[PDB]
Design a protein around this ligand. Structure first.
Ligand code: CDL
Ligand code: PC1
Ligand code: 3PE
Ligand code: 3PE
Ligand code: 3PE
Lengths: 57, 459
């Protein structure tokens, strides 16, 4: 009763039932480093300007 | 200070937009008007300095130097317009422009609140001064004089720039008022020794300090008359003004770091005074006289007493008017005989009677006849130096004997004896020359009536 699969059939992506649980950390990665604290808030003009030597702006 | 900066800037369009034959009349008239308004800087208080803004201020130290500076500009225009008479119009206007720009840099230099603003303007004065010496000087040696002037100043001032920026990084400010309250004592370490030298050598070279003075007899002698007037009257005093300010942040290290420079000055003043006795060039003699007088200012600043600081301020003002007058007197003879040799033209009292009176008055102020402000400044320094060490009175005393000798030797050689037979072009003194001399000596003697206004912040 075997029917030869048609052109293109064996290259299909199929779905399989399995009881093996999905691996949680397949790469065995360490915990990632914490990101640097975000800079937030409203942008305000610089206090007394550039403050470069004698410049007042 | 904008009420002085903006009018000074307007002298430039005034000069360029004037009728061709009114460039000297217009610039002289309006520069005198600016000089008149500078008297408003005399609103000084017993406790607080007159602090205009974030950028500028004036206290009893800078105020007299500002008034002298603005007074000198019209005198220099008068002194220059004869020997520039054949210069073409555009080059005349550029000459006046250099003088105006120098005044602009100077008045901002003396009122700068922040030491790095002071530095930029302090170096800025080099550029117009170099151009005046090299472009409008008369002899081949002006080119060499310009290089000595430029590289002596920069050799010292570039280490000062590093020091000042270092101080701002450590203190957080170079504002002079802030430094009065945030100043910390200087610990005695090798690193602080070179900070002290960096903060002082640039000012020492400008005084000049004996040993580091070789640029001055070249520059002051090769410059045109306006160049010599400002070089001796004001630019030497940038060094004194800078030292008087920066010593605030150098205590107590100045106690022992002063010794080598006090010895150079106390012995140097006797050396340079002796040199004057054997100089053959009249302009060169007057230039070496300045080195001897500024040696007293160096010593007075380094011993750091209230009396020495009042004396130093008076001497700087007194010397400014006197040395400028002597250069103008010497120049008036040069414009007749076209030589700077002192023995060439003799017995000029017989041919130029009134001009011989200016020579006498200029000489008497130079040798510090009391009660002139020249004597008041010298006396206060001698008093304070006696307290620093009684033995100094010997060196001070010898210098006063030598100073009298070369001051009157210059007077006797040129004005007295018999006139030189073959020199037959000594025409009578012009009204311009006589007014130029009296605008030096009259303010100088008037200050004797009210000396306090030139005694500085310690008064
Ligand atoms: C031709 C004229 C064209 C201008 C007129 C145009 C009119 C339309 C604009 C409307 C208007 O009037 O408002 C704008 C402006 C006024 O604005 P404001 O809000 O009403 O009041 C501003 C306060 O006055 C001041 O308020 P502030 O102090 O908070 O802000 C000023 C601040 C920040 O502002 C700036 O940085 C700009 C500073 C220059 C602005 C001045 C106007 C520019 C046009 C004139 C340029 C002439 C140059 C002179 C050339 C000299 C020869 C070498 O200044 C600084 O911090 C920098 C310190 C100085 C830098 C020095 C660097 C050292 C090397 C250069 C030395 C060379 C000598 C100085 C000459 C170069 C100019 C400094 O126009 C002006 O009237 C300028 C007045 C002068 C203010 C200068 C600030 C003090 C510094 C003194 C420096 C000495 C030079 C002064 C030159 C003045 C000549 C008149
Ligand atoms: C750079 C320009 C020259 C001066 C710079 C500083 C000195 C360098 C030359 C001396 C190096 C050896 C130091 C010896 C020593 O112990 O210190 C001096 C010793 C005293 O030093 P000290 O051992 O007491 O240490 C000083 C204190 N501390 C370390 C905290 C900073 O003797 C002197 O006092 C002589 C001073 C030498 C300089 C004399 C005048 C100038 C001469 C150079 C002219 C150059 C042109
Ligand atoms: C911190 C305190 C400071 C106070 C103390 C200051 C001490 C005084 C410093 C003086 C500086 C040197 C003298 C400057 C005077 C002018 C020099 C001069 O005019 O010499 C003339 C000489 C002749 O050659 P020249 O003029 O070219 O021939 C005619 C073609 N023009 O010209 C020449 O031969 C070439 C001259 C080259 C030198 C130019 C000046 C540079 C000075 C900085 C030296 C750089 C050192 C760097 C070295 C680092 C590695 C060791
Ligand atoms: C010619 C070419 C050669 C040019 C000279 C070469 C540089 C000479 C080096 C002098 C030593 C100055 C120095 O390096 O001091 C470093 C010091 C670092 O210390 P810091 O960490 O900043 O603060 C804590 C103190 N340890 O810093 C400090 O603490 C203070 C530093 C102040 C700034 C000093 C600027 C350099 C001065 C050098 C010239 C001074 C002498 C002038 C001439 C003397 C007379 C001949
Ligand atoms: C001709 C060229 C013109 C240019 C001139 C340039 C001048 C640069 C001078 C730089 C010298 C700076 C001094 C550097 C040495 C280190 C200073 C130091 O830290 O030593 C500390 C110590 C202080 O001694 P003390 O007073 O006892 O301590 C307090 C307790 N009472 O040290 C002391 O004992 C204080 C005494 C230090 C001064 C010594 C003076 C030497 C003799 C006088 C020389 C005059 C200058 C000679 C120049 C010739 C150059 C060819």
């Amino acid at each position: 009763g075997w029917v030869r699969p048609d052109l293109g059939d064996l290259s299909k992506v199929t779905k399989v039932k399995t009881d093996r649980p999905l691996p949680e950390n397949p790469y065995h990665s360490r915990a990632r480093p914490e990101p640097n604290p975000e800079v937030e808030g409203d942008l305000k003009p610089a206090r007394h300007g550039s403050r470069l030597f004698f410049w007042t702006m | 200070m904008l009420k002085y900066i903006i009018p000074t800037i307007m002298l430039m369009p005034l000069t360029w937009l004037s009728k061709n034959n009114m460039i000297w009349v217009n610039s002289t008239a309006h520069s005198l008007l600016i000089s008149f308004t500078s008297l408003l800087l005399m609103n000084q208080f017993g406790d607080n300095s007159l602090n205009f803004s974030l950028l500028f201020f004036s206290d009893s130290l800078s105020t007299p130097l500002l008034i002298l500076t603005m007074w000198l500009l019209p005198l220099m225009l008068m002194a220059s317009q004869h020997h520039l008479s054949k210069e073409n119009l555009t080059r005349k206007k550029l000459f006046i422009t250099m003088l105006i720009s120098l005044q602009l840099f100077l008045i901002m230099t003396f009122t700068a609140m922040e030491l790095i603003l002071f530095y930029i303007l302090f170096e800025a004065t080099l550029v117009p001064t170099l151009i005046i010496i090299t472009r409008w000087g008369n002899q081949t040696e002006r080119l060499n004089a310009g290089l000595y002037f430029l590289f002596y100043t920069l050799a010292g001032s570039l280490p000062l720039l590093v020091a000042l920026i270092y101080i701002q990084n450590t203190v957080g400010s170079l504002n002079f008022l802030m430094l009065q309250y945030w100043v910390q004592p200087v610990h005695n370490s090798w690193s602080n020794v070179f900070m002290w030298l960096a903060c002082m050598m640039a000012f020492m070279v400008k005084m000049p300090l004996y040993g580091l003075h070789l640029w001055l007899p070249k520059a002051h002698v090769e410059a045109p008359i306006a160049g010599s007037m400002v070089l001796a009257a004001v630019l030497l005093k940038l060094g004194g003004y800078g030292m008087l300010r920066i010593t605030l942040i150098l205590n107590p290290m100045t106690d022992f770091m002063a010794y080598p420079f006090i010895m150079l000055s106390l012995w140097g003043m006797i050396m340079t005074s002796s040199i004057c006795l054997r100089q053959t060039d009249l302009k060169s003699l007057i230039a070496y006289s300045s080195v001897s007088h500024m040696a007293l200012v160096i010593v007075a600043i380094l011993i750091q007493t209230p009396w020495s600081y009042m004396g130093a301020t008076a001497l700087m003002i007194a010397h400014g008017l006197t040395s400028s007058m002597l250069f103008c007197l010497a120049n008036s003879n040069y414009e007749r005989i076209h030589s700077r040799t002192m023995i060439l033209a003799r017995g000029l009292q017989t041919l130029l009677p009134l001009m011989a009176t200016w020579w006498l008055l200029a000489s008497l102020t130079n040798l510090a006849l009391p009660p002139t402000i020249n004597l008041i400044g010298e006396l206060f320094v001698v008093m304070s130096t006696f307290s620093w060490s009684n033995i100094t009175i010997i060196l001070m005393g010898v210098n006063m004997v030598i100073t009298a000798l070369y001051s009157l030797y210059m007077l006797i050689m040129t004005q007295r004896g018999k006139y030189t037979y073959h020199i037959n072009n000594i025409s009578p003194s012009f009204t311009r020359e006589n007014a130029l001399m009296s605008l030096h000596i009259l303010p100088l003697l008037l200050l004797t009536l009210n000396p306090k206004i030139i005694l500085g912040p310690l008064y």
